Amino acid sequence: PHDIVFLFDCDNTLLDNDHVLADLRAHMMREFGAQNSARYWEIFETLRTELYADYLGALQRYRLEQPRDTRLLLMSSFLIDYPFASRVYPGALNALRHLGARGPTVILSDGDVVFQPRKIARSGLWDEVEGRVLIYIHKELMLDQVMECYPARHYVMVDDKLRILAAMKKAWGARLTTVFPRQGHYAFDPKEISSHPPADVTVERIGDLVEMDAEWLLA
Amino acid sequence: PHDIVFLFDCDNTLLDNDHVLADLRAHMMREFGAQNSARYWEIFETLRTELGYADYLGALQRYRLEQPRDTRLLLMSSFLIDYPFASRVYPGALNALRHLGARGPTVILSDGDVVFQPRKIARSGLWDEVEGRVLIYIHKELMLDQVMECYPARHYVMVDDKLRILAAMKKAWGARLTTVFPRQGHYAFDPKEISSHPPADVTVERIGDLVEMDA
Ligand SMILES: [Cl-]
Ligand SMILES: [Cl-]
C-alpha cells in the first residue's frame, strides 16, 4: 500500500478553468455569432446542470437543433489548441512536486473522453503525475476503483467543489482529509457553501499546501 | 435555383482516409499495446457496422465504459487531432473542386461526429476550398430534403465511394441526380458492395478525372 496518496481535482484546483471558459465564450461569439453562441450555452448549462462541463453533449444537441450550422462545431478547435499550461496556478506544480516526495500524486477528475484528457495532457499536469490520472463521469461514484488503483492508509482530496468532498468524506470518513482551496466560482456560490459540511482544511491558495507537512502525519 | 450543384463526400473521395486509419492503427499498436487497441477496434467495427459511418468518438465512449481505468488509450484522439490532413487530399481534388466551382456550388456532404470529422474537413483545407459549404450529418441519405433546401439546383451530382449511399440517393432523386463512384479506397475493391448494390451513373478511376466534366 502507501502511507498517503494525494488526490487532486484538476479544474479550478490545479488549473484555472473559469479563465478557459471566459476565453471560449468570447471566441465563440466572435466566430459564430452572438445568437448562435448564446444558444449553445443555454444547452451547455442544462448539461452542466445534470452531470460538470459537458462540452460534447451540448455540441451533439446543438447539431440536432441547427444541422445547417456546421461551423459552430469548430469551437472544438479552440479547446483542442488552447494554451492550458498557461492556466496552471502559481505554486500548483510546486505543490505536486513537494507532496509527490511524500506519497503518490494522482489526478481524479470528472470529464468526457476527448477534451478533459487532452486538457490534462497538454497542460503538462498529466506527466507531472507520471500518468496517474483517472477520469470519470462521476468520480465520487467510483471511489471503490480509486482505492484499488492507489491503495493507501490515508487519502487527501483537494477539490473546489464542496459537494464532492462532502460525498467522498461520507464514503471514506477518517481515512480522508478534505482540502478546499478557495478558487473559482463554486468557492463563492452560496448554495454549495451553505448546503454541505465544511472541508477539514481550507487553504486560500493551492500553493499553501507546501506549508503543511505536519498535517500528513508521516514518519 | 442553380442549374447544377456538385456534392462530394470526403473520406476516400477528396481525402485518402484509409492511409489515415492505417497510420492511426500503427500508432495505437505502438503506444497503447496490442490488446487495448484490439478491443477498441472490435468496438469501433461494430458501431461502424450499425451507425453506417466511422464513429471514433462513440467507440471511445464505449471503450471507457468497458475499460474505465485505461485513461491513456483515450489519448489516441490526439493523433487524429494533430494529423496532417492536407497531405492526404488526393491529387487533382483541389482542381476538380475549383473547375467545377466555376459551373455551380461545390458542397461537402459527409457523415460525421461533432469533433473529429469537422476538424478533418477544416484542417485538410477542403472546408475553405468549398468556402464553408459543408454539411455533416449522422445519416446524410436520410437528410436529402434539407440538402435540397440549402442548395436548390435543377440537377445535382453526388461523388461518393459508397454505392449504398449513391443508390439510396438515386432512389430518392432519380433523374435529378448523376451519381459518381470513384475507384478509391477499400470500397472500390469490395465484392460485397459492388454486388449488393447497383452501379452509379458514372464510374471514374480518380477524383481528378472530374475536371473533364463540362456539361
Ligand atoms: Cl478568434
Ligand atoms: Cl449555376
TrEMBL record, chain B:
Protein name per its UniProtKB record: Haloacid dehalogenase-like hydrolase
Pfam families from the UniProt entry:
Hydrolase (PF00702)
Q: Which SUPFAM superfamilies match?
A: HAD-like
* UniProt source species: Paraburkholderia xenovorans (strain LB400)
